[PDB]
Design a protein around this ligand. Structure first.
Ligand SMILES: OC[C@H]1O[C@@H](O[C@@H]2[C@@H](O)[C@@H](O)O[C@H](CO)[C@H]2O)[C@H](O)[C@@H](O)[C@@H]1O
Ligand SMILES: OC[C@H]1O[C@@H](O[C@@H]2[C@@H](O)[C@@H](O)O[C@H](CO)[C@H]2O)[C@H](O)[C@@H](O)[C@@H]1O
Ligand SMILES: [Mg+2]
Ligand SMILES: [Mg+2]
Lengths: 724, 724
């Protein structure tokens, strides 16, 4: 409808109506739900909610199906005075019913189109079940694999994170200004604003602290890119940002998000984060929490009651302007209008059962493709892999048969539709002997049984991994290791004298040195989603050629953390030339380098890269154009990820030794050659100075072109002169 | 001499003379050195130093003896044009020849007077060997025991650090205005300005980052307190502060140190730190390094040649004002004048050989007392300790006979003067059987010898620890554990059936769970210094009663780091009454609490405390007066450390759950009772806000009185009303 009609609605609502429009509730707090109605009575009572509240609530969180939605919306519109339909929101993080790889695995793809397609398929299905908004992309930079929520990030690089964030937004939303017509796309909600990934000691919800400059330099750019690409909502973070919980942090959310980033959509709280500012010790009570969170421009309180119980008295007493409440309501109604909910509150479902669009074969194929793009081949000694279809396989370990391959933050997908490792292998390989073992134990009887199966077969597929419940939210591990039993199983299998491939499933970097040394090949599958066993079987047999690169550094040991490729030099760097001197930046007991670096991943193919003549000089404001010719010089078709890094040699702030500024994943048949070109704009050369100005300084930059952060040729470009 | 004549000298100096005044060199770069003379010509050549440079150099670093100093100063003064004597500086960190406990252990003393005495003795001896300045106190706050330099800090609390920092300055300097007269005291140099102990991942020289607010709130207060107490010099830090190496950080050194903190003494670079800004990437070359470091107010370049080769041209070209140089020179000359060098350049040594004053019996008794104050009794199950003097002792492990008990940063003390554990124990106990093992091995042959000795005796003194070389500078350990052979040894010894005391020697918190669980008692001796074997024997026999408390938390495991007592609450705190629940701040694999907390330590005595009646309300600006009555209710004389904490329940920044604001260590005879009183000024109630104002807000505080950060009674005071 026309904007005048939306503004009119605001004018006509009562104060009590405007307040309740700022509340989101679980579906079973509403009449007309068709699941968990036994939770409704006691929980309404604990939260002290009445019909006056629920019949005017702004939003529903986590509907269970199209029918839940339809029934809830229908009963709500019988009783709502002005006819304002509910907006339905959900967590569609890496797939709805067709589950794609976890975001961190999608980071390792380095493939923007894989990510867009995952987001498109997710929206297709999620809209078919009545959801209007997804709480994705998660854009928290991560340098600390202790934190369970690394699985939801695309990793340690702001540039990569930004680029894949934009891809996800584009895939979920399509053309943002036509969400009232394109009812198979949905609104995206960027989360968690801001810097939640920097949780101290990797502990869930724990203190975050960095300088404002570092916040701008590394922690904000990805949210920003997703905002500028049209993300409709933003969600606040749990953590403090320079001492103030992000939810009530006025500077953060008004000055930065709404001012600098020019965000003018719904700011929704993370779950309970409005009330939790009390726990943080920056509000005395719910009256202060409500006031501070509304001052900071939070429009929508997720499942707590500070707003509904306290805004009236605040406004009546004049501690809080009613204009701020009106601004919040207007953003909520604009969101609804942007989804076409005032013409069609059932968003395409009312006379159109779209069951047919859910978990199709086309969709499963895309997830399989996603899975094969995201896996990272870490070791392959002796060209053990690809295995031949007639190789006789002993498939052993906790991930041989486990149905737990869909990943954390799989709110809607079902393990029964998933393909386990065994089932995946038996479609491809004629001889497989299996010995399942438990995640945390290694018994004598297991060893006997493993030994018998290995004696029978020619190669071992050792499937190790985490349960998903060991990560995700509030799955923090102080020591980033598999259970010791799995390391002991890898040690045992090694003694059996047969070649070993380890297929590792997990949601975080782990200490894998012991696994690499106990096997001939090591394939990092992360959690691939619905098609996990086929992803695995196609990569092992070579029907697919691994092409993933690490988007997060794998530490030598827990105590190396944080370790990341874009690090400062320090005043006493170790060099190949001073190696072994005492008075340099090193550890006595491990290497400075991570076990595996950002951008690292093997292939069954071999590539050669050639960079065309770069200029020796560039003007300020001028783009650098990088042309690179890649050739597949092997007999095996495959894909390589070309990466370009920039370094600022001398600057008014100590700058990272490299930063990624471009990447493209290039597909090449055996003997095929391509030229790809990159533009590094002058923004790729700029950074935040100690005055928090985004600046370009004249001087020397090095440019690194290659296939990891370590495998690069280096070039020098001197920036100076005039500007543009 | 009169201030007018100090000025006169500056006018009288040539540009080349003023430049060289800002250079510090090792003793063997000067003519007249009585040691390492063979190094002179080559290093001179490598640094491109001439006679004109060395003959006008400002300062000597690390003189080897009184005769080095005398010889150097005597030759220097025969050729110096204007008669400006050299100032001699040294690393006297926890003792000169009489070595006291490492500073972290002195931290565990909670004893201001012990700290002042260490410093007074240190100056007594150092001045006797011709040193004018010590590079102490080190006041870097530490939360990361991976960093080897934690041994030099007094720990994780800024208040303790502030308080003991003041004590060391007083002990070294006495009355600062009379350093020209009191030739047995010396100048203190506060180090390292600033925030060096926050090195990322505990890696030496590594990136530091935190918000400016946190810099002010936690990282600056102890340097400030030492400066206000009259510290004569300050030394720069190796690390970046917010992206800019401290040594050239104008904001840090002019605005904060010289401006806010009103420091008007010599600012000396850490070793090479001027040249190292090039390595950091914030200067292109030694001309830029010199210019920026002089801009930042660094007066004295330690053993690099940026100033000496670059200032002239910088001043000639007009890129730098000669006034900044004149100011650096005046500060150097004023420090010499404060030390009396213009009347007596030999600072009391010339016709008075003070060999008599070094390593006296009186001094050794003070170092032993310091060791007994500083040790921390962590476990004592079932009154194993004190041992009766007729107890038959199996003394086993790497620290049984090791002479490595003086600690890191022992530049001048000699192991030959130290007392090892066996020698100590044999002065007190009649029967000791000794089996020495290696630091990093546990052989079958050791196990047989250990077993034979334990079967012979009644009790096991298991002496474990670190070589000092595994810490101190550039002694960074990714995993904070002893060698695994020592943990194995503690497991083996436990199986032998006999009570075990573990006496642990080290320079950092370690993972000690496995030691506590494998023994009956556990005594943390750190590195006590010269009298270590007697410190240990007296604590074990009960001739001295353990009284130290932990000044740094001992983590459950490496991956818990940083863990510290003054932590934020977060938005989802684990409570007693939600424990077990998933969605709270916790780890899946360890407790939140450190294995041992700040302020914790046992005693052979038992004490009772009761806090006199506190007010319910206080005005802003008003002090809180806290009266505590302590009774020793055992038959054993000893000391308790009374500790007072404050918490700010609600603030405009999320405030720590506790902060230490007072402490006093009370000596009590069996049955003795004493009353102590504390004043917490309105400043204890104040913090830095998000605009970086030092502020006091009305509201609730809790006051905790007790004998650890955990063993406390709690009281509430509501601050409001008007201001005093
Ligand atoms: O789910 C929406 C939003 O909130 C958080 O999930 C919450 C979790 O914090 C806790 O409240 O448990 C409830 C159980 O339903 C979850 O909904 C997530 O941190 C956030 O990412 C998510 O988008
Ligand atoms: O001792 C002077 C001063 O500088 C540093 O010590 C240096 C060390 O950095 C390295 O360069 O090696 C030389 C060996 O002589 C040391 O002097 C210390 O970090 C600092 O604390 C000390 O006060
Ligand atoms: Mg530059
Ligand atoms: Mg307060």
């Amino acid at each position: 409808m026309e904007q005048e009609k939306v503004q009119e609605l605001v004018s006509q609502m009562t104060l009590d109506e405007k307040i309740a429009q700022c509340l989101q509730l679980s579906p079973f707090l509403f009449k007309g739900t068709n699941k968990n109605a036994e939770l409704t009575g006691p929980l309404l009572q604990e939260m002290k909610l009445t019909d006056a509240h629920t019949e005017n609530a702004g939003s529903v969180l986590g509907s269970s199906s199209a029918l839940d939605m339809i029934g809830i919306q229908e009963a709500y519109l019988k009783t709502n005075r002005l006819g304002i339909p509910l907006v339905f929101m959900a967590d569609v993080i890496h797939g709805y019913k067709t589950v794609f790889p976890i975001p961190l695995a999608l980071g390792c793809s380095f493939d923007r189109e894989t990510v867009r397609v995952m987001a498109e398929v997710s929206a297709l299905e999620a809209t078919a079940d009545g959801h209007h908004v997804t709480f994705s992309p998660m854009l928290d930079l991560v340098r600390d694999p202790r934190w369970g929520r690394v699985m939801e990030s695309t990793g340690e690089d702001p540039f990569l994170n930004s680029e894949l964030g934009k891809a996800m937004v584009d895939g979920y939303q399509g053309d943002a200004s036509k969400l009232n017509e394109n009812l198979e796309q949905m609104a995206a909600c960027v989360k968690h604003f801001a810097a939640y990934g920097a949780a101290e000691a990797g502990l869930e919800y724990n203190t975050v602290n960095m300088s404002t400059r570092e916040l701008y330099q590394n922690y904000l750019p990805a949210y920003n890119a997703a905002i500028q690409a049209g993300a409709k909502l933003v969600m606040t973070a749990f953590n403090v940002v320079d001492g103030i919980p992000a939810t009530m942090n006025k500077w953060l959310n008004r000055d930065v998000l709404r001012g600098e980033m020019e965000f003018d959509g719904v700011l929704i709280s993370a779950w309970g984060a409005v009330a939790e500012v009390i726990n943080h010790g920056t509000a005395r009570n719910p009256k202060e929490a409500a006031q501070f969170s509304m001052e900071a421009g939070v429009d929508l309180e997720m499942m707590t009651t500070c707003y509904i119980h306290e805004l009236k008295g605040l406004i009546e007493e004049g501690k809080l302007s009613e204009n701020l409440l009106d601004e919040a309501v207007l953003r909520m109604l604009n969101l609804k209008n942007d989804l076409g909910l005032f013409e069609d509150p059932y968003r395409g479902l009312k006379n159109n059962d779209r069951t047919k669009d859910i978990l199709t074969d086309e969709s499963r194929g895309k997830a399989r493709a996603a899975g094969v793009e995201s896996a990272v081949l870490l070791e392959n000694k002796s060209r053990l892999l690809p295995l031949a279809k007639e190789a006789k396989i002993a498939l052993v370990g906790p991930l041989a048969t486990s149905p737990d391959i869909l990943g954390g933050w799989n709110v809607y997908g079902e393990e029964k539709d998933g393909i386990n490792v065994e089932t995946g292998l038996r479609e491809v390989f004629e001889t497989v002997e299996v010995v399942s073992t438990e995640y945390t134990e290694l018994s004598e009887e297991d060893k006997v049984a493993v030994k018998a199966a290995v004696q029978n077969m020619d190669v071992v597929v050792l499937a190790l991994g985490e349960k998903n419940e060991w990560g995700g939210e509030a799955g923090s591990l102080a020591t980033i290791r598999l259970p010791e039993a799995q390391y002991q199983l890898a040690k045992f299998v090694q003694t059996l004298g047969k070649p070993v491939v380890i297929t590792l499933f997990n949601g975080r970097p782990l200490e894998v040195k012991e696994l690499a040394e106990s096997s001939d090949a090591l394939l990092e599958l992360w959690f691939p989603g619905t098609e996990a066993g086929r992803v695995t079987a196609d990569l092992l047999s070579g029907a697919s050629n691994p092409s993933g690169k690490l988007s997060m550094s794998f530490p030598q040991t827990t105590g190396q953390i944080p370790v990341y490729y874009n690090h400062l030099r320090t005043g006493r760097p170790q060099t190949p030339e001073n190696k072994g001197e005492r008075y340099v930046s090193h550890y006595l007991d491990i290497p400075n380098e991570p076990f595996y670096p950002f951008g690292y991943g093997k292939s069954y193919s071999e590539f050669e890269l050639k960079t065309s003549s770069l200029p020796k000089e560039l003007n300020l404001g001028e783009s650098l154009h990088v042309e690179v010719t890649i050739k597949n010089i092997s007999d095996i078709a495959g894909k390589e990820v070309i990466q370009v890094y920039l370094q600022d040699v001398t600057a008014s702030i100590s700058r990272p030794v490299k930063e990624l500024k471009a990447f493209e994943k290039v597909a090449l048949q055996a003997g095929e050659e391509k030229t790809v070109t990159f533009e590094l704009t002058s923004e790729a050369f700029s950074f935040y100075n100690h005055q928090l100005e985004k600046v370009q300084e004249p001087g020397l930059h090095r440019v690194f072109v290659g296939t990891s952060s370590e495998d690069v040729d280096v070039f020098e470009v001197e920036v100076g002169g005039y500007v543009l």
